[PDB]
Design an enzyme around this catalytic site. Structure first.
Site, mmCIF file in Angstrom:
data_model
loop_
_atom_site.group_PDB
_atom_site.id
_atom_site.type_symbol
_atom_site.label_atom_id
_atom_site.label_comp_id
_atom_site.label_asym_id
_atom_site.label_seq_id
_atom_site.Cartn_x
_atom_site.Cartn_y
_atom_site.Cartn_z
ATOM 1 N N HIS A 181 -7.488 -6.574 0.737
ATOM 2 C CA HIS A 181 -6.381 -5.641 0.549
ATOM 3 C C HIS A 181 -5.096 -6.022 1.314
ATOM 4 C CE1 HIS A 181 -4.406 -1.939 -0.371
ATOM 5 N NE2 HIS A 181 -4.539 -1.414 0.829
ATOM 6 N N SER A 224 0.802 -1.218 0.000
ATOM 7 C CA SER A 224 0.000 0.000 0.000
ATOM 8 C C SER A 224 0.843 1.280 0.000
ATOM 9 C CB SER A 224 -0.946 -0.005 1.200
ATOM 10 O OG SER A 224 -2.069 0.820 0.955
ATOM 11 N N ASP A 283 -9.983 -5.905 -4.367
ATOM 12 C CA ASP A 283 -9.345 -5.054 -3.393
ATOM 13 C C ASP A 283 -10.193 -3.808 -3.257
ATOM 14 O OD1 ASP A 283 -7.860 -3.369 -1.883
ATOM 15 O OD2 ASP A 283 -5.943 -3.991 -2.728
HETATM 16 C C1 LIG Z 1 -5.802 2.384 1.684
HETATM 17 C C2 LIG Z 1 -6.325 3.327 2.734
HETATM 18 C C3 LIG Z 1 -7.580 3.601 3.059
HETATM 19 C C4 LIG Z 1 -7.595 3.977 4.529
HETATM 20 O O1 LIG Z 1 -8.587 4.880 4.953
HETATM 21 O O2 LIG Z 1 -6.332 4.532 4.754
HETATM 22 C C5 LIG Z 1 -5.541 4.021 3.686
HETATM 23 O O3 LIG Z 1 -4.385 4.165 3.611
#
Ligand SMILES: CC1=C[C@H](O)OC1=O
EC number: 3.1.-.-
Lengths: 285, 266
Positions: free
Chosen positions: A264, A114, A235
């Protein structure tokens, strides 16, 4: 050779203090395993390095593996979270680079989940000679929808999220954990919840604002490092068209691994699959 | 050499003048402590490591003759402390690691200022005057099951050791149980059931905190009382409301506070 000794001798000094060295303790850095092949594991929002525990044993027999916590993680002393300094991703980047310098690591492979995927992309651009390879999981160059670009999130949407987080954080997190895990894996959900509760609500809010803010679409072409783009099935925060965008637009040699599992956080929810995916992505570089 | 540090995956985390060592039990590794670790690292320096028999250690390092009883595990423990130049610490031990630390502080009394024992027994076998929780025949049957088809056994065993319905604990344990080579699990399982420390308990001088859970398959309530009565140091018993043999996996919201209070001054 003695000269080798003294050369390392001065770079410990040249740089004693820094951001890096002190960072080792601040960011709970851990080196595990053996190999002259180095692998960095960089976790994402809501977790800490314990997120990698299930897959870690599958890598340590023939890789030296470096783990650290993002400065926003609940396992890090929160007084260390400078709200000005970590305004955007660039400062998280500097931390990574300072950790790796302090450890004296000239070449590694990088695995980022991420936002850590964003961090790694930027670090590779900042230091093409340090990252032999990128492995990107649950990654997106931009979360907000745009005129021709489906991010998966509208501004009004994130603002609602913000409000829920600020209103009662612990309640928000309990509700969030399952949606982020996506799959019906009650152990991933309870693990993600726990590290999510550990974070101080203001830092979570700051970090999320910093993520949703970011847009890397313009600099994907500058990456020179080979990348494996790892994408799961449904995801929630990464549509498949994005994974698709990210792959076409990275300028190093890029391959996609489309996981059969949904959610995710596959390193938490599908470690039986991701471990093997990771061995293969990290076998040579 | 402290190539031992590398071999056993040793980790140091946190800050403080007070050192704490976390030592795990059968079928897990140091990841078992992750949920409570962040409650310790602000004001403790924490040392974690993996027993030579954990699935996350290279199994080639497992010498069946050397690790024939617990003295070798103790050697490893002490060598880690010596390699780190730690002259004093508190030790936190789960299950077999509770036995280890007991042997350790007998061996080096000055090194351990305090012991915290979780799911602790001095002897798992039943005996004439002693209710330990297990019988020989029953043990032989577990060995058979483990040797017959190890994974299928591990899957059935995890939920019963976790005890409580906390599927997340069931899954972590099962996972680290899967990582162990079957022959190593048997050998370590074996070593634990032939171990009897009842004779050396009174030699412990360190203050001890004994942490007992409500329905611990491996540890009758009375064993904890026994420990309490015979440990030779100043000793207290903490009774957890929660069920099960692995509270760091299944009751970490509770155990963490227990540990904070157990490690606040020593
Ligand atoms: C992927 C993502 C959603 C969340 O609210 O915070 C994040 O980084």
């Amino acid at each position: 050779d003695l000269m080798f000794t003294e050369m390392r001798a001065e770079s410990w000094l040249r740089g004693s203090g820094s951001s890096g060295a002190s960072l080792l303790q601040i960011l709970n850095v851990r080196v595990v395993g053996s190999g002259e092949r180095v692998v960095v594991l960089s976790h994402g929002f809501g977790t800490d390095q314990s997120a990698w525990s299930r897959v870690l044993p599958y890598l340590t027999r023939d890789h030296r593996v470096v783990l650290y916590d993002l400065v926003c993680a609940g396992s890090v002393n929160p007084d260390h979270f400078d709200f000005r300094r970590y305004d955007n991703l660039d400062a998280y980047v500097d931390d990574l680079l300072a950790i790796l310098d302090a450890l004296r690591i000239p070449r590694c492979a990088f695995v980022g989940h991420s936002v850590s995927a964003m961090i790694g992309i930027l670090a590779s651009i900042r230091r093409p000679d340090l990252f032999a390879k990128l492995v990107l999981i649950g990654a997106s160059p931009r979360f907000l929808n745009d005129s021709d670009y489906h991010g998966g999130f509208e501004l009004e949407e994130i603002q609602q999220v913000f409000d829920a987080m600020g209103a009662n954080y612990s309640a928000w997190a309990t509700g969030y954990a399952p949606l982020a895990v996506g799959a019906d894996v009650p152990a991933a959900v309870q693990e993600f919840s726990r590290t999510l509760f550990n974070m101080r609500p203001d830092i979570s809010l700051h970090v999320c604002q910093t993520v949703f803010k970011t847009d890397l679409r313009g600099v994907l072409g500058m990456v020179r490092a080979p990348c494996v783009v790892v994408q799961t099935t449904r995801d929630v925060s990464v549509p498949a068209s994005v994974a698709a965008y990210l792959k076409a637009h990275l300028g190093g040699r890029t391959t996609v691994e489309f996981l059969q599992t949904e959610g995710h956080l596959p390193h938490l929810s599908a470690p039986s699959l991701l471990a093997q995916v990771l061995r293969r992505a990290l076998a040579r570089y």
